[PDB]
Design an enzyme around this catalytic site. Structure first.
Site, mmCIF file in Angstrom:
data_model
loop_
_atom_site.group_PDB
_atom_site.id
_atom_site.type_symbol
_atom_site.label_atom_id
_atom_site.label_comp_id
_atom_site.label_asym_id
_atom_site.label_seq_id
_atom_site.Cartn_x
_atom_site.Cartn_y
_atom_site.Cartn_z
ATOM 1 N N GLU A 172 -2.189 64.427 59.022
ATOM 2 C CA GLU A 172 -3.482 64.008 58.879
ATOM 3 C C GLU A 172 -3.967 62.633 58.019
ATOM 4 O O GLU A 172 -3.035 62.167 57.931
ATOM 5 C CB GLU A 172 -3.710 64.691 57.207
ATOM 6 C CG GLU A 172 -3.344 64.804 55.952
ATOM 7 C CD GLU A 172 -2.981 63.642 55.365
ATOM 8 O OE1 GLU A 172 -3.660 62.537 55.092
ATOM 9 O OE2 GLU A 172 -1.913 63.147 55.952
ATOM 10 N N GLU A 315 -0.333 60.760 57.512
ATOM 11 C CA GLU A 315 -0.553 61.192 59.319
ATOM 12 C C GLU A 315 0.670 61.688 59.959
ATOM 13 O O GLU A 315 0.830 61.895 61.064
ATOM 14 C CB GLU A 315 -0.036 59.889 59.085
ATOM 15 C CG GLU A 315 -1.252 58.723 59.051
ATOM 16 C CD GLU A 315 0.029 56.936 59.001
ATOM 17 O OE1 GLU A 315 0.495 56.773 60.357
ATOM 18 O OE2 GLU A 315 -1.079 56.429 58.513
#
Ligand SMILES: O=C(O)c1cccnc1
Ligand SMILES: O=C(O)c1cccnc1
Ligand SMILES: Nc1ccccc1O
Ligand SMILES: Nc1ccccc1O
Lengths: 347, 347
Positions: A172, A315
């Site tokens: 994310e 991420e």
């Protein structure tokens, strides 16, 4: 359509797993000596999308990007625009996930599920809205929006399986997202906000109290139902969190493995398992996030990460870092010699 | 010659490390968010043999093979001949280290420092004798033999550095070697044998008591001096253990990093650091061995492994599995973009 999806998640193949365990026991080494690598190999063998053996074909890291209304509550020190900027960098190969995924031979798919900025060329467009609602004063989104995104992301994920992808990684990008992550963990685990609220992206220690307060208000005001993962996601979650849950439901429906990342991913996995317990067998932990609520979240998922790197970037960076480990289980399984062939007998 | 060697071990380059830390802080991510990967990158930057930056060129895993006289005390259930058989398999690429090293792009060097069998073609010959003395009734070897092997292995190691090798991994192979490993750990840490004696290669729980007894006898009879690592190695160690210590002294003298493996390697590292504290900065942990005395040994070396895989195979298998992690630190350092270039300012 969502009921169908959840209904069709396959159970693990116990027959393939037994054959795998026997093969592993016969390899050139004391039985059980490769520990968790052996367990991982067996787990992979039970996943229907892998053809009865621990195999890894193409690899993909799906990064869900979205902005959050709760950023306005002063729970994050990163400028809100960093979501949009970093998402663009994700298409240039300069970010932490990009570099680690490249090292693992995986491709990064950047998906915009709700960034509060103009559309970014090169990023997959599944934008629900320009950022979700501020959870401190109401819900992040409607139940309908949550269900639609789950379906959307789920289909996208299993469709990649048709392109040779056999291993997924979830990630994310969204400023302030450790706030809804913490609210969800508190709700699913029954833990107090103070026990699961962390510093996120370097939040000063002096502003933690406010963050804890925001999480409690979010829960009190929305009254999310712990036994309904979609209710929780739509009320105190966010688009990025819903998207990650969707990757997990999609990979499971596809009978394929998914590597979790850090704290945000743990929140999404608690939601996914609440919604469909059948998803659990397909989840593979990567690292142990340095975020405060990690221990509690992992304990509720009964997961013990392989990597202890004190990482807290997000991420999908941790997911990418663990991919070689999954490849190692395959290598072990397929390439090692056998005890019998060397005339070795051990008690 | 050994005094010269120990004398010439370079201290880490603080200047390169400061430059590294500043560069890492400027990368596209919240400062400190990649945690231990950042710390590892800085550590590598301080190693003189690497050219002031975290870089990895060729990789090698050195596996030290030897037999032990204490096998006769019934401390190991694997047939003694397995050392000779497995050493031969090491030249065929079918063993656990071979498969994992291949996955990491590393070459495995098999070194015979004392196998009790005829010479094996393809294996590096540095044989001290056909197995070391039974430590339960006397010393494993003479001080002279220990010092000679240290020098021998040390030179071999640093000579590989001239062939492009920049990262080493250490491993062993020798039936019953978790017995001298435990004796050494007990001696260096001041822990009681019962606290550091494990099941090794599946030793039945009923035979543990005998193993603990053998370790105590070894110590009582030899009276090794804890403040003299060579005294300890020669008295209650073994050829494989001495060899591993030699790889560590050689890499350090060469100013290069060495990845530890499991329990046997921890024993060798305690000896190496006792002999030359300057060696410590060059050691990099890999995984957390499932052997009982691992926690105590790691605590005394002040090391926290990256991988928790419940592994206990040995052979340098854990070292090989962690090599991608070292490559990740390099990738991060050299390939990530910078905050300033994206116009991002974080407090
Ligand atoms: O655990 C994570 O993934 C994380 C923790 C803090 C901030 N961003 C990501
Ligand atoms: O930790 C190890 O390397 C180990 C433990 C038991 C038996 N052989 C190797
Ligand atoms: N391969 C192997 C077999 C038996 C004991 C130890 C080992 O490393
Ligand atoms: N790159 C980055 C920058 C700021 C906050 C979170 C992030 O993942």
């Amino acid at each position: 359509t969502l009921h169908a999806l959840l209904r069709d998640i396959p159970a693990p193949d116990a027959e393939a797993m037994a054959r795998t365990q026997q093969h592993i026991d016969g390899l050139l080494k004391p039985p059980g000596s490769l520990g968790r690598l052996e367990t991982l190999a067996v787990q992979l063998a039970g996943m229907p999308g892998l053809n009865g053996t621990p195999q890894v074909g193409e690899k993909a890291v799906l990064v869900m990007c979205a902005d959050h209304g709760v950023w306005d509550e002063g729970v994050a020190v990163s400028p809100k625009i960093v979501t949009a900027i970093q998402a663009a960098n994700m298409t240039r190969g300069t970010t932490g996930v990009c570099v680690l995924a490249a090292q693992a031979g995986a491709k990064v798919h950047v998906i915009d599920v709700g960034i509060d900025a103009e559309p970014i060329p090169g990023v997959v467009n599944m934008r629900v809205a320009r950022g979700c609602g501020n959870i401190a004063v109401g819900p992040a989104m409607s139940r309908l929006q949550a269900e639609a995104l789950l379906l959307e992301v789920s289909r996208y994920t299993c469709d990649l399986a048709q392109r040779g992808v056999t291993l997924f990684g979830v990630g994310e990008l969204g400023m302030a997202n450790t706030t809804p992550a913490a609210a969800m963990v508190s709700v699913f685990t029954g833990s107090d906000a103070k026990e699961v609220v962390g510093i996120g992206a370097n939040l000063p220690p002096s502003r933690i109290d406010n963050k804890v307060d925001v999480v409690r208000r979010a829960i009190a005001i929305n009254q999310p139902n712990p036994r309904d993962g979609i209710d929780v996601l739509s009320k105190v979650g966010g688009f990025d969190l819903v998207g990650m849950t969707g990757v997990m439901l999609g990979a499971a429906r596809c009978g394929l493995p998914v590597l979790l990342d850090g704290f945000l991913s743990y929140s999404a996995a608690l939601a996914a398992c609440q919604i469909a317990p059948a998803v659990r067998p397909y989840l593979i932990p990567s690292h142990f996030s340095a975020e405060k609520g990690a221990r509690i979240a992992l304990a509720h998922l009964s997961m013990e990460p392989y990597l202890h790197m004190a990482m807290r970037l997000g991420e999908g960076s941790g997911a990418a870092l663990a991919m070689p480990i999954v490849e190692a289980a395959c290598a072990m399984f397929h390439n090692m010699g056998e005890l019998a062939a060397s005339n070795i007998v051990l008690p």
